[PDB]
Design a protein around this motif. Structure first.
Motif, PDB file in Angstrom:
ATOM      1  N   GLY A 134       0.833  -1.250   0.000  1.00  0.00           N
ATOM      2  CA  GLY A 134       0.000   0.000   0.000  1.00  0.00           C
ATOM      3  C   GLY A 134       0.851   1.276   0.000  1.00  0.00           C
ATOM      4  O   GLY A 134       1.085   1.874  -1.028  1.00  0.00           O
ATOM      5  N   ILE A 178       4.696   0.412  -0.793  1.00  0.00           N
ATOM      6  CA  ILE A 178       4.809  -0.006  -2.219  1.00  0.00           C
ATOM      7  C   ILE A 178       5.365   1.165  -3.041  1.00  0.00           C
ATOM      8  O   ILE A 178       5.886   0.999  -4.125  1.00  0.00           O
ATOM      9  N   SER A 179       5.235   2.349  -2.513  1.00  0.00           N
ATOM     10  CA  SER A 179       5.732   3.557  -3.237  1.00  0.00           C
ATOM     11  C   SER A 179       7.161   3.885  -2.799  1.00  0.00           C
ATOM     12  O   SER A 179       7.972   4.347  -3.580  1.00  0.00           O
ATOM     13  N   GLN A 207       7.877  -7.441  -9.955  1.00  0.00           N
ATOM     14  CA  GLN A 207       6.544  -8.101 -10.036  1.00  0.00           C
ATOM     15  C   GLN A 207       5.576  -7.360  -9.117  1.00  0.00           C
ATOM     16  O   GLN A 207       5.981  -6.562  -8.295  1.00  0.00           O
ATOM     17  N   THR A 208       4.299  -7.587  -9.262  1.00  0.00           N
ATOM     18  CA  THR A 208       3.322  -6.860  -8.407  1.00  0.00           C
ATOM     19  C   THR A 208       2.091  -7.730  -8.154  1.00  0.00           C
ATOM     20  O   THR A 208       1.488  -8.268  -9.060  1.00  0.00           O
ATOM     21  N   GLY A 209       1.722  -7.855  -6.913  1.00  0.00           N
ATOM     22  CA  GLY A 209       0.528  -8.676  -6.562  1.00  0.00           C
ATOM     23  C   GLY A 209      -0.147  -8.112  -5.312  1.00  0.00           C
ATOM     24  O   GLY A 209       0.379  -7.238  -4.659  1.00  0.00           O
ATOM     25  N   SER A 210      -1.325  -8.597  -5.003  1.00  0.00           N
ATOM     26  CA  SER A 210      -2.071  -8.116  -3.801  1.00  0.00           C
ATOM     27  C   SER A 210      -1.989  -9.159  -2.682  1.00  0.00           C
ATOM     28  O   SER A 210      -1.891 -10.343  -2.933  1.00  0.00           O
ATOM     29  N   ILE A 258      -4.307  -5.503   0.405  1.00  0.00           N
ATOM     30  CA  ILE A 258      -3.479  -4.326   0.060  1.00  0.00           C
ATOM     31  C   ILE A 258      -2.601  -4.688  -1.135  1.00  0.00           C
ATOM     32  O   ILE A 258      -2.346  -5.844  -1.407  1.00  0.00           O
ATOM     33  N   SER A 259      -2.157  -3.710  -1.857  1.00  0.00           N
ATOM     34  CA  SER A 259      -1.315  -3.982  -3.047  1.00  0.00           C
ATOM     35  C   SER A 259       0.141  -4.073  -2.607  1.00  0.00           C
ATOM     36  O   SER A 259       0.538  -3.427  -1.661  1.00  0.00           O
ATOM     37  N   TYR A 260       0.944  -4.859  -3.283  1.00  0.00           N
ATOM     38  CA  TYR A 260       2.381  -4.965  -2.887  1.00  0.00           C
ATOM     39  C   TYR A 260       3.249  -5.129  -4.126  1.00  0.00           C
ATOM     40  O   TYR A 260       2.823  -5.654  -5.136  1.00  0.00           O
ATOM     41  N   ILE A 261       4.465  -4.639  -4.043  1.00  0.00           N
ATOM     42  CA  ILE A 261       5.403  -4.700  -5.203  1.00  0.00           C
ATOM     43  C   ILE A 261       6.681  -5.436  -4.854  1.00  0.00           C
ATOM     44  O   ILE A 261       7.263  -5.228  -3.810  1.00  0.00           O
TER      45      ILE A 261
END
Lengths: 89, 89
Positions: free
Chosen positions: B40, B43-44, B67-70, B78-81
């Motif tokens: 979230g 991730i930035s 890669q990127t997944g939730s 939440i989103s995660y990278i």
């Protein structure tokens, strides 16, 4: 035309499923490839959309490419993600 | 040992340069490969650290994978990278 090259930017104002909804619709017109771009907050929105779109079939979905860099947005530096995708079915 | 396989998670409590500082120090120890993970908000902070770390040389830095997944975080999604990187110099 754009049968397989739809480049789109994600937003933080729109929910995630709003882009997963607009995506599954685009993949109905033959859009197998797609590019989601996001910044600071929208950055993670592109992720969920793809994650939730992957959780859709995984097979009918493929990760051809993804990249990440920062840029200026509002006279300030911010992070951004370039998420690409491909459909196999 | 871990001369080329340092997997670390990024946070939103520190700062971008805080992780760029700890990274340039790890590379100094021979850590050419590294994996930043964020969620979230963090991730930035992971993308910035790298984008800024690239502003350092580009040649002495390489993007091996990303890669990127939730995922679930606090009984919520939440989103995660997953950001990977490789040093060439």
């Amino acid at each position: 035309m754009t049968e397989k090259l739809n480049e789109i930017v994600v937003r933080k104002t729109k929910n995630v499923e709003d882009h997963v909804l607009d995506v599954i619709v685009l993949f109905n017109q033959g859009i197998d490839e797609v590019i989601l771009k996001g910044t600071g907050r929208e950055i993670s929105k592109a992720v969920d959309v793809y994650n939730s779109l992957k959780d859709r079939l995984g097979d009918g979905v493929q990760l051809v490419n993804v990249q990440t860099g920062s840029e200026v947005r509002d006279r300030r530096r911010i992070s951004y993600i370039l998420l690409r995708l491909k459909r196999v079915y």
